[model samples]
Target: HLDTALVNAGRRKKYTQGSVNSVIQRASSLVFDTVEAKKHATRNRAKGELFYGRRGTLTHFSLQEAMCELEGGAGCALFPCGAAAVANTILAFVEQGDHVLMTNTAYEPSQDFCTKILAKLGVTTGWFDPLIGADIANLIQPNTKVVFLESPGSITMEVHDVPAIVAAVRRVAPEAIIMIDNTWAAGVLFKALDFGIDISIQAATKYLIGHSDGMIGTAVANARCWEQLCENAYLMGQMIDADTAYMTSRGLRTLGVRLRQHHESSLRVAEWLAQHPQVARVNHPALPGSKGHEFWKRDFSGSSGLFSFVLNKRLTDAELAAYLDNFSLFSMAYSWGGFESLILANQPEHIAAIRPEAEVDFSGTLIRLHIGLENVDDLLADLAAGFARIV
Candidate 1:
């Protein structure tokens, strides 16, 4: 159902010149039929009637439709990058003196935005445990405006009880906006708006594009918050190019197929890693003994390839480099959701201090892997040889 919708969902404007795909529109100026038509375009610009290039064109509109359908959102807004989507969502709602709650495990850049940028703007930020569930009631303030979450939280890979978190916030501050940085789910597997979240943000840079070529962020909203999202994005003067939109949409066509391979291949790789004598723990939510595995199975319909694991013992800097450098198949890179597998190792200081039992009790040698479309057998053999370098 989703795959069909992803491929087919888009602008159905009549008189499209009989093109199967939306045409690339890369013009700065669009002619108006009349003065009345010009006025009409501006009035409905937020409704996606193109008033200016800054407001986006047909290419952007089609991409928006595809994401909104996948996310089950009333509307979706396009931004230059995923970080922009996250930043704008928070900045759109809160005012000076208002308080907001964020998951401790949210993307680090998001944390920086709240602490550095929002603080400079006079908003107060608070952190909540990702595993808090409905017990989040205690964090609410009369001035609270937003509760932000990022499940299977980035590098640490903690799966949040988002529905429970939403319930807790609503009970105390029904007017408070609930937003999620749902990049991990790609707005496909986990329906954020369906879980009563007000805003759902995706980088689209990752799984949505499937390739590592484009940078786009999509912010999807339910009926309750759709108008605000549209207005806020308009005011921000956001724009994405026709080329970026076109490429991202092309990638969206195969998302359903790509995700399944990522899911199955990563799980196989993870299962192998878990049994390795050199591994202490696998932090994948979908893995049987992985962290938040139970919550993942219960609430989420599927999982992705990005996950982390700890070594049986800590590795020295030289040893860590040797292990990483030895891998022929896994490249070292920052982002995931591409066709190529990448690996990085880190044991964030915050993870150790805040969640000791879940993290620090084990060895600090944490390695994150983005399993790709590589043959599973070859990937496993490469990892085995990589592990041998440390031993």
Candidate 2:
């Protein structure tokens, strides 16, 4: 929860100039003495009353506000990590006999959550092609409770036909809740709920925070699915620290400006990679020849700083290591979206479900890049140098 007390206390008042004792005292007084705090308040009580006694307290109010504005929804929940948000939301609406449909290229953690936890609980998950769109209607069953999607999927950057899938789901299984992971765009590039998605999830650890220091996740729901999400979140006792919430809120203030720079710089670097002699292809929706370009153009308002590239010639494990080792500016890491650049090698065998024939050839080893706030020319030169050494 983004409550001032929790956030300020946890961060030891690093973001704000204060002490933990002061923060705790402030939060305690506010929580236990709402009447006293409200004495100075002049806002209309008819707007809404703060439910300080309930699990849904003011600590996470900032997260609620962010979700409502970005995803076009009035309901939201926060968790310690993106995986917790996804797992809790899934368990909330589904039962042992219920069926869950997910995109093949979904976040790896999501897949693991379903297989390891959900499967043990008796719920069955089926992977579907993200590009299936209206065709997904054919897979619906009497027990299908949720359909999960991750557009411009984390690894492949495949933009699915979300509107078409929503339309189909509405017609075939109106009872099923539609969920999407909007982390790639961070709601800045796409509004999932507006396109008929019932629940939208985001890895606040990524672009939402814009910095990779903390781990947080969010789930926003439409009126149709809000009650269940909130109820489940409370029952699971999933709460974000106040300090993380505050930092995320702070990062969100500059989301628009940061995303613009990311879009411009990432596209430039991706385009350069596409034309490079040593690169076989680049996977970026903003590029002209990208497989998901059309869907991205139609569904998203913009792009993020992440994308992947395949080498022209397949490389051995050692060769891949050499390529990563050769980079001076790009750090080899797992998470992304900080001011510094990051790179990682991906393998297709690690992903399941919709395995396209085209991706198989390059699946052995591909390079993923997270373009940062560095100057475009400098980043380009660094990448070029890395490729020159590898090739």
Candidate 3:
């Protein structure tokens, strides 16, 4: 089972460095025993030789191997944050005069990086709908260098037809690199590389850290894209400290049970929300009512805790405050995949501000939720009372 794989991923003798877990070997300069040794280390630097701290020490290599094992990739690169992983992965591949296709429902920072930074670098970006499927082929250009996706996309919770999208990209633009922010899937629920993706990136800061205390990012590249990803990332001076890397590996040990509870409890909350009088729609991919539920069922092995629900009415500022301020369990927060329940609200206008080109069909206010390990009944009760506060 996958659980067994998670538990044993980075425990090999070499990775462990003769411990149950990898020893945190922190050093800026690794001493060479001889001139021959230095020559050999220089020759095989990218192949796990510890020449310098930036090249990665034992802790980093173990986590990199662990991620490659978990995500099914030939190599893995580390970053200080999930945004760095997304930004650097794209930057590594594309040069001036390149074009990239990004989903309209992408994480806001991702879209920001493209429009603000990439656009200025003379690299163009075209925002495509998440549910476009095979029609995505029409959006590809001769200069297209990348196709980026984020499944069950930020806030809206729309799962794309990833296989259809992948096939289209391969058929029309084989030279284009296909990448996805596989953070929601926790890099486990959906095997991105197996479905023809060239590089699978995760904001390991969320689920892999699990406690919301540390920040780290990982990019697992398939055999076709491994060397380029590694070299480019290194040239760009991307590497996380050994401490967070060590913590990420420790967090991976409990990822299976953590995700299982998150899955079970989230489903209960989503189902209850679906039947509520105040709810216009629940944007959870596990439910049949979600936008791309069929594709999710076919592609994803399971769902995560993050999802959203639309209110039947768009509350005014005072009403929104009344509803949100008294929640007992769910706290207002920026990020998810932690041990605590969290909530954030978005109006149609709010989404319009971020995705100006998107055709937003829902008039109701959208509330994004990250259902934690709290009792499902208790969370439901809290929601019921919060709804009562709305006037």
How many Å off is the CA of 275 in candidate 1? 1.0
Clash totals in order = 0, 6, 0
lDDT of 1 by residue, 31-89 (tens): 78999999999798777787777777888788777777778888888888998889988
lDDT of 2 by residue, 1-391 (tens): 2233223222323223453221211132233256654643324211223433233334356456656765678677788888888989888899889999988788877888888899988999887776787999998888999999998986778789888899999999988899998888886588888888888898899987887899998998888888778877778777687667766766776677788899999999998888888888798989987767898998888888999987776667788777778787889898887777899876555433334222454644568899999999999989888877677
Q: Assess every candidate by TM-score.
A: 0.95, 0.86, 0.98
1 against 2, candidate with superior TM-score: 1
lDDT of 3 by residue, 312-339 (tens): 9888998888988889999998889998
Stretches of model 2 off by over 4 angstroms after superposition? 1-59, 351-364
In terms of TM-score, how similar is model 1 to the real structure? 0.95
Candidate numbers sorted by TM-score from highest down? 3, 1, 2
Sort the predicted structures by lDDT, highest score first: 3, 1, 2
Model 3 / residue 243 / CA error / Å: 0.9
**Span of ten consecutive residues with least summed lDDT in model 1:** 354-363
